Each structure stands twice: as structure tokens, then as C-alpha cells.
Amino acid sequence: MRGQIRGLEMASKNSQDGISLIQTAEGALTETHAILQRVRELVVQAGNTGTQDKATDLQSIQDEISALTDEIDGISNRTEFHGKKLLDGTYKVDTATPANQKNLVFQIGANATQQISVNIEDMGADALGIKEADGSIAALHSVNDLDVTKFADNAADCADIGFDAQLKVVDEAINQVSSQRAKLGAVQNRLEHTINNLSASGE
């Protein structure tokens, strides 16, 4: 009994630490997300200004966009909790070889199998896709946004120059980030419920 109890207090502390780790991830994804908001604006007025401005001015807008991208890769390659990068592809949700997932199995109780798994995946190449992102589309749409000089070639009807495709994949990246954040906040709620359960078990 006593061993169980002390491991339950330690279980409370464990889950609290897990919540904190997540909160780090959620500050990071928050800032990344705000970046994608700014990017979306730049893509919309890249939309109009592809029919008002020149390819030069679109190169300037592109300079701003690529800078924001380098911040995305930055946050995904600096965000660490206990020196372990969370956002990078370390914890691919489903590796082709499932052995490589390296899933975040936090301790939640004081006995065997009383754990919960977690996954994170986000970087520059966090755009549309199936298993990999894709090639010319859907990976660079977050890394190298097409509004360079390409965008003046066509309106929406190439699927790799088109306005509609590009913007759709921006909103896709925003959808993946928002989904990730939603999952993580859900984990925080779960862990809260677990702390209460452990508190009653300690009682």
C-alpha cells in the first residue's frame, strides 16, 4: 500500500510535469500559428498584387514570407523541454516502420501499463500530404511559397502555380497545426482529470 501511495504522489508530479512539457509545445505552436496567420495575409495580398504589382514586388513579399518560414523551422528546431526537441520529426505520428515512433509514454499511475502516449509532428514542411508531404506541392507551400514570379503565370489552374491551391495548402498547414494544438490541450485536460483521480486515491 505505502509503495503504491508514494508512487501516486509521484504520479501526480509526473502528470504535472507532462502538462508543463505540453505547455511549452503550445507556446511554440501558438507562435508558429500566428506566423501562419501573417503568411495567410501575405498570400491573399499576393493574390491581388499578382494582378497589381510586378514580379519584383512579389519577390519582396516572398522575402518576408521566406523569413517567416525560417522562423517556422527555427521554432521547430529550437523548441526543447529538458533539451529534447519536441516539434521536429522525432515523434512522427506513424512512422513507416512503427518501431521508430518513439512515442511519449508519460507515467500516470504507480503501477504497470498506467501510461498515456503522445505524438508531435511539425516543421517547415508541415503542409498537405498523405504519407510524405509531396514534392513540388504541399511541402514547399509552407517552406517556399510560390508567390515568387510564378504566381503571375496563372490564376488558379495549375495546382502548383494556382492561387487556390497555394492558399488551400496554407489553410491546410493551419489545419494541421490547429489539430495538433487541439490534441495537446486535450491531453492537458486528461492529465488534469488524472491528477484529481490520483488525489482521491491518495486520500
Binding site: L29, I174, S178, R181, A182, L184, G185, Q188, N189, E203
Partner: protein, 49 residues
């Protein structure tokens, strides 16, 4: 019995109520019930798209 007061539940209760006050401050200082991602996930994503 002396090693165990029954009012340890007042300490878990007190930590819980304190945590409530903490969320309250984080909502009042921010004016946002979605201040942290947690505590409303779906509402966040909706509000974000």
C-alpha cells in the same frame, strides 16, 4: 490517530481551488478563455480558422 489528519482533503481541496484562481487570473489578465490552448481545444481551432 495522529500521522493522518482527515483534513489533508482540505489541502488537495486548497490546491484545486488555488489552481482555479490561477486559471481565473490567466483569463482576466489576458481577457481570453482560450489563453492557453487547453481548456478549449475545438473552440480554439474554430476561432483560429
Amino acid at each position: 490517530i495522529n500521522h493522518n489528519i482527515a483534513a489533508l482533503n482540505t489541502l488537495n481541496r486548497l490546491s484545486s481551488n488555488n489552481s482555479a484562481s490561477q486559471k481565473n487570473m490567466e483569463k482576466l489578465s489576458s481577457g481570453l478563455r482560450i489563453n492557453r490552448v487547453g481548456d478549449d481545444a475545438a473552440g480554439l481551432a474554430i476561432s483560429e480558422k
